[PDB]
Design a protein around this ligand. Structure first.
Ligand SMILES: Nc1nc2c(ncn2[C@H]2C[C@H](O)[C@@H](COP(=O)(O)OP(=O)(O)OP(=O)(O)O)O2)c(=O)[nH]1
Ligand SMILES: Nc1nc2c(ncn2[C@H]2C[C@H](O)[C@@H](COP(=O)(O)OP(=O)(O)OP(=O)(O)O)O2)c(=O)[nH]1
Ligand SMILES: Nc1ncnc2c1ncn2[C@@H]1O[C@H](COP(=O)(O)OP(=O)(O)O)[C@@H](O)[C@H]1O
Ligand SMILES: Nc1ncnc2c1ncn2[C@@H]1O[C@H](COP(=O)(O)OP(=O)(O)O)[C@@H](O)[C@H]1O
Ligand SMILES: [Mg+2]
Ligand SMILES: [Mg+2]
Lengths: 660, 660
């Protein structure tokens, strides 16, 4: 039923790739008469200086590797359109991206093409949209420093967010340095109205600057340390009742939480709200130095004191009703980062996965790709028994590292703060998809001991691969110029800063030796992301999370197969699945091992989830996007899940909270 | 009953002025501990180098020249406050302003003080608020050029409006160069959403940047030529029903109307809407050159054609329901302006009185004062007969000219575009209040022939005075550096460009002689304004408009007196005045001459109004704020009043439309 919509595009599309390129490159806007080339000069020339190799490299059967709503995703917003009509076949997209990345290095270009066609890995949406086009904006993440506590700084920053927001890419914006409601203003002997009305401005600019033309309104995440005096209204930003003038329903509130806050809450003690003018320096330190400053300011009567658990209660009431604010731990992030030699890090990003240094003159950028976990499953020399090919994983992650590092040099930056930042530090971000499928396919329930060991092994091999590739690059071209002085420069790597020994699949000593000697090309390398749209392009389950339902109507393909094998699949079976809302538990005539393998995420303990996140995190340079799920959520239920994660030492304690 | 609130401030206030200054200069913000001097170094020193002259110059009886709600205006927002409590007596305010203006020129300082105390004239609110303070922002008007048709230009301009909006002063913003709904965007192969969503941004910045601290939200007027393609939604911006997402209820729409539009409407012909990208140059010319460009673009199929009267009908429906959009005539403004040698003028301002050149790098500023017309009435050598002292008027207008020109050199500009603009051209704006009182006091009904002659004489003497004072200044210091090439440089003055000979009270030939020889100091000098708050400080009727009602409860003091004189005033008299809504017409026992003198503005023909505006305008360098009033308004009624004004050659055809 879904080759019917595939084999109509093959009907109404040119075959030869270079002709498609020419077509795109020569395009003209009919309603206007101006030449609108959809390919850059650079890539045009490279295709033409090499027409015959490139044209014969493409294998068009690889267009059937796609699914029901997987293809109609590529169709509806990825493949370049000519006259509101699709002009690019899936393979054409892929080949374009490979060249946009590699330039005159044709050998690299063909390598990338193959591994993407076969679905080994994919680059993030911005790269899929823009690679190979006239002004190549391939980056997904921007972390912006609010430039100064003044109207000038504020409006300079607002400008920058619009300039960034108009060319794809999500924003993490940190605002801890903006004075709160009531605070004194010298220049006009007047009194500030604080964060919420200012939040309304950014909100309004978000709904106006609908990315590029009319593509889609912007998404901002805002980061605040919970000691800021406007905190109670900041967390409530997404409620759907009460006074309309105090909300801001297109933005996401995110908490940048210091350890001190969590102590006061479990101690059932006090918490003191400040304005950053009465208490300067607080976001410019962490850990011990911070607790020394905060405690003194608290002693000096400089703020207002509250019952710590009064705030907590509100925070939980907000999360239960709206699934926000997100929770990320400031101290964990700063203490365990290879960017520490640059200064203090002030926020994460839109999906709580990036952890990079930003300042008024440096805006942090990151470029992203995801490896497809199921692709490396190998049922080798007997069948009905499968193994996992870690040597191939290591191989692939090395190429993805080279791509992402080449992307840095060929990307178009929307703002000069971004170009300065990337050329100096060269951060990079790799992630994954299809974990649940990998588990399902290997017959491991998500909460099994076997699943836990696998999680650890995968993430170890990815980190080691990327560091090595980055080391070879530092041999050809130098190290990144900020390398001198880094934890890496002394032989401290990521698991080191968690005080753990690595699981040991790969040889860390020789890698460390080489690194200390020749340096490394990239300040950072790992940051597992949500894959919300790329994962369904490839047909795997989102991310590194379990399934939400055995029926999205279309039924779990691994479950489906199994019920037929056992005969039991009939019509009583069709029904109690749409009835029981995707649950196979408590179903009369169904074996236990199946019930075990097809637990819905509302049926797995959130304690298990936290543990697996804690396990992989020692292999992550940056952070990762951890959603949480609950049936009939009580205040107590949530409290324990937050504290549990905090104590495991997680950077990102909570992304969304989904309920009922 | 209103010396009760006056003689409590005299109770709770220091006498000696220099002590009040010291008090203000040494002020410290208790809640913060930072020194918050409410006076500049400069003025502090000058008071102290001259303590004894200045202290003994003030006459404190002049504090009783004020009214019921006239004083409680000064009180509630003008007099400098110390701890939420008033610290400045009316006379102190005045003396401060005089020094802020004059510096080390003590003689000038004392002259200004006296004439203000006695209520001869007053400066505009910003000057009353800020003169003599640390960063003196004395200007009321900013005309801003939208810097470029791009996100960068847009957000650069938004910044500038916030920087201007945070330090008092209203804004006129011209936006004719922003591409409309649907228009193509190259950089992101996408389609623009046009003016209305962009208007929502500026709206949102207006309600957020509540002038200075929390003083009061901003007021913007927006200027558009009615050929812009989003016009139909632009005029509807203040309707209070229909889709909430298309309105913008804190801004005022204003039409920058070319002659061509009005012709098409009376011809019952066609009108063509463009985007400024499909039709460039249109706001960068006027008159003939414009009609040549527009007609060609119309021929070249570059826009969309409509029935001219379809637009007109909407415009009138908008005005009838909301009193807006305002109407100002582009061609009249450009053709009759002494700034023509600089380039084409693109808008007026917030109250449709300023007409000055702006560009991305020059933001037009104007500083304003109003002369009090009743003050020069002289019942001389017999009583029960009054004359008008024009020689004193000429005298005073000369000093007000010197003040305003000194204000230019000592003003603090919020943005560099403003400082560049003023230092080069040096514009200036004088106006008036108490016309109706002047008429009432001199026993002339507003529609009398005698009233018409008086209007003309007043405005002639003011213009001639200001030009002469400006000529003497060009002798000491040079002419303004942009003087070479101006209509003034060749002997063409304002009435000249209306092709009229002056009424002749003053000697224009000798003035012209001197000007051609030595130049003049100021590019411009005259612009009668609304006086909405300054007029009630002084207790006179707003502006140059007739009375709205004989009872604002408090009854017309000239009417009141007259009814007692005739006995007829009793209780039947108290009632039929609150009953008849301030009208004395059709009142049984009341003489005709009284009915004639106390016509409410809803009882005077709007044709008379237009004529008087036309008469004075030949003596106005810039423009003036013309409100219009109607009982049971029909589409036809309005149409004739617009066209009538247009044909008289008015710059500002309509400010508000008040109804019922
Ligand atoms: N809502 C609102 N906030 C304002 C306004 N003016 C200033 N603020 C807030 C925004 C900034 O966070 C903070 C400082 O603003 P600026 O540095 O532009 O003010 P200024 O330099 O005159 O005063 P400062 O000496 O820095 O306190 O005050 C205003 O007119 N409206
Ligand atoms: N609402 C909205 N309008 C936009 C967006 N991008 C551009 N525009 C409008 C605003 C400007 O009036 C106009 C031109 O914008 P820019 O000059 O920044 O775009 P660019 O230089 O890429 O395209 P151009 O070659 O100038 O047409 O397009 C957007 O993302 N959202
Ligand atoms: N709705 C959105 N608007 C803007 N940016 C987004 C959005 N969703 C995700 N992003 C950006 O992409 C990253 C998340 O990636 P992901 O959800 O995996 O998207 P994709 O699969 O399309 O690459 C974030 O770091 C964020 O900066
Ligand atoms: N509500 C307002 N907000 C901002 N500026 C204003 C406002 N009202 C008037 N202005 C400014 O002052 C001028 C009008 O002066 P006027 O109404 O006579 O005020 P005032 O009597 O207080 O000086 C306009 O040119 C405008 O720039
Ligand atoms: Mg400042
Ligand atoms: Mg541009």
């Amino acid at each position: 039923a879904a080759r019917i919509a595939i084999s109509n595009l093959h009907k109404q599309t040119t075959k030869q790739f270079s002709k498609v390129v020419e077509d795109l490159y020569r395009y003209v806007n009919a309603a206007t008469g101006k030449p609108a080339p959809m390919i850059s000069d650079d890539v045009y020339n490279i295709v033409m200086e090499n027409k015959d190799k490139l044209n014969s490299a493409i294998v068009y059967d690889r267009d059937f590797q796609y699914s029901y709503f997987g293809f109609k995703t590529l169709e509806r917003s990825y493949l370049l359109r000519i006259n509101g009509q699709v002009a690019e076949r899936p393979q054409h997209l892929i080949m374009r991206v490979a060249l946009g990345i590699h330039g005159r290095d044709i050998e690299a270009a063909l390598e990338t093409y193959n591994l993407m066609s076969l679905k080994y890995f994919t680059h993030a949406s911005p790269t899929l949209f823009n690679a190979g086009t006239p002004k190549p904006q391939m980056s997904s993440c921007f972390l912006v420093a609010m430039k100064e506590d003044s109207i000038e700084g504020i409006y300079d920053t607002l400008k920058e967010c619009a300039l960034i927001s108009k060319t794809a890419g999500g924003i993490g914006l940190h605002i801890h340095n903006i004075r709160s409601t009531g605070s004194y203003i010298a220049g006009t002997n007047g009194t500030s109205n604080g964060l919420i009305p200012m939040i309304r401005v950014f909100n309004n600019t978000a709904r106006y600057v609908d990315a590029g033309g009319n593509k889609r309104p912007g998404a901002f995440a805002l980061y605040l340390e919970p000691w800021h005096a406007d905190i109670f209204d900041f967390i409530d930003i997404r409620k759907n009742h009460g006074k309309e003038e105090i909300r801001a329903r297109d933005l996401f509130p995110a908490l940048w939480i210091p350890d001190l806050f969590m102590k006061r809450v479990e101690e059932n003690g006090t918490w003191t709200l400040f304005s950053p003018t009465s208490a300067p320096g607080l976001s410019d330190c962490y850990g011990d130095e911070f607790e020394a400053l905060y405690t003194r300011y608290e002693k000096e009567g400089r703020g207002k004191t509250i019952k710590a658990q009064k705030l907590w209660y509100s925070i939980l009431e907000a999360q239960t009703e709206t699934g926000t604010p997100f929770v990320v731990y400031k101290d964990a992030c700063n203490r365990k980062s290879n960017q520490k030699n640059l200064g203090v890090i002030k926020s994460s990003n839109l999906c709580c996965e990036i952890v990079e240094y930003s300042a008024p003159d440096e805006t942090a950028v990151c470029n992203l790709a995801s490896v497809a976990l199921p692709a490396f499953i190998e049922t080798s020399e007997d069948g009905k028994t499968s193994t996992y090919n870690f040597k191939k994983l290591h191989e692939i992650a090395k190429v993805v590292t080279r791509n992402l590092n080449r992307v840095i040099d060929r990307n178009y930056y929307p703002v000069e703060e971004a170009r300065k930042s990337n050329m100096r530090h060269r951060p990079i971000a790799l992630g994954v998809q299809g974990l649940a499928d990998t588990f399902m396919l290997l017959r491991l329930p998500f909460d099994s001991e076997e699943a836990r060991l696998l999680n650890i092994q995968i993430f170890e091999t990815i980190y080691h691969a990327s560091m090595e590739a980055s080391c070879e690059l530092a041999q050809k071209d130098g190290p990144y110029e900020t390398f001198q002085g880094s934890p890496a420069s002394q032989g401290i790597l990521q698991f080191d800063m968690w005080d753990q020994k690595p699981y040991g699949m790969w040889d860390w000593d020789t890698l460390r030796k080489d690194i200390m000697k020749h340096g490394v090309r990239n300040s950072l390398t790992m940051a597992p992301m949500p894959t919300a749209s790329t994962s369904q392009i490839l047909g795997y389950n989102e991310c590194f999370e379990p399934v939400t339902s055995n029926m999205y109507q279309v039924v779990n393909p691994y479950l489906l197969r199994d019920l037929v094998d056992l005969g039991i699949w009939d019509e009583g079976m069709k029904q109690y699945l749409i009835t029981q809302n995707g649950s196979i538990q408590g179903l009369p005539n169904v074996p236990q091992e199946l019930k075990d393998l097809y637990k819905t995420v509302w049926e797995i303990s959130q304690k298990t989830i936290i543990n697996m996140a804690a396990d992989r995190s020692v292999y992550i340079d940056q952070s990762h996007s951890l959603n949480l799920f609950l049936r009939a959520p009580t205040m107590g239920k949530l409290t324990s899940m937050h504290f549990y994660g905090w104590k495991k030492g997680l950077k990102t304690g909570m992304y969304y909270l989904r309920t009922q």
